[PDB]
Amino acid sequence: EAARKRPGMYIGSTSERGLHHLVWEIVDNSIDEALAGYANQIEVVIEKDNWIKVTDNGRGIPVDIQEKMGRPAVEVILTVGVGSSVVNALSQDLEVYVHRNETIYHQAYKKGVPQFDLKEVGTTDKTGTVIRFKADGEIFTETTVYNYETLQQRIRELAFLNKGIQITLRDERDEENVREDSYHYEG
Numbered sequence: 719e720a721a722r723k724r725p726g727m728y729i730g731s732t733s734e735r736g737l738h739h740l741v742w743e744i745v746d747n748s749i750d751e752a753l754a755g756y757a758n759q760i761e762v763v764i765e766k767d768n769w770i771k772v773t774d775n776g777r778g779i780p781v782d783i784q785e786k787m788g789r790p791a792v793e794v795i796l797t798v799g800v801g802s803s804v805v806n807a808l809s810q811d812l813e814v815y816v817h818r819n820e821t822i823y824h825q826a827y828k829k830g831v832p833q834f835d836l837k838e839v840g841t842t843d844k845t846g847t848v849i850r851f852k853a854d855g856e857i858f859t860e861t862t863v864y865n866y867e868t869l870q871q872r873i874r875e876l877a878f879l880n881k882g883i884q885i886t887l888r889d890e891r892d893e894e895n896v897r898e899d900s901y902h903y904e905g
């Protein structure tokens with residue numbers, strides 16, 4: 719309720735500017751993984767009902783119990799790095815899927831509140847993190863619709879700034895017209 723009561727301090731504004739900042743924070747975490755030498759592919763998806771899906775082929779947010787807290791690391795990071803917690807707090811629903819240790823780990827949240835303990839929901843050969851979120855309509859009272867062009871412009875800049883990372887943007891809001899933009903700069 720720290721981020722919810724005063725959302726201005728944590729993200730900036732609750733307008734369209736603050737709405738797209740939700741996406742930048744989540745993507746910045748995937749770019750960090752790529753800069754460390756552990757990811758090379760990031761995918762930003764605008765899904766039905768303006769849900770956002772950000773996927774990377776990183777190491778997967780660790781799932782091991784943190785000795786002090788007594789909870790998995792993914793839970794800790796997302797419910798306070800600071801940025802992911804704020805996005806979680808400002809979202810009416812947030813889902814995380816971690817692909818690590820040949821297992822698929824899942825946790826869902828509501829307004830930053832864990833709905834259930836981290837559960838194992840599958841098996842994998844791949845590593846990476848999938849973060850799905852729906853912005854809180856009660857917080858973002860102006861608009862809850864992402865402007866594709868605003869997303870495309872910053873994604874193009876980030877792929878250019880961070881050479882060698884493939885960043886893809888896909889709009890799937892209307893199944894009748896699916897637009898996609900793939901960026902990858904060697905230079």
Ligand SMILES: CO[C@@H]1[C@@H](OC(N)=O)[C@@H](O)[C@H](Oc2ccc3c(O)c(NC(=O)c4ccc(O)c(CC=C(C)C)c4)c(=O)oc3c2C)OC1(C)C
Pocket residue numbers: 746747748749750751774776777778779780781782791795799802847
């Ligand atoms: C929001 O989570 C972000 C990550 O987001 C994404 N997209 O992967 C990413 O930006 C970055 O990811 C890191 C940052 C550091 C390590 C890292 O130092 C690792 N080394 C380990 O073997 C390890 C194993 C277990 C463990 O709990 C920790 C420390 C825990 C951390 C950093 C959450 C480290 C590792 O496996 O994964 C790491 C990962 C995936 O830091 C987070 C967790 C805040």
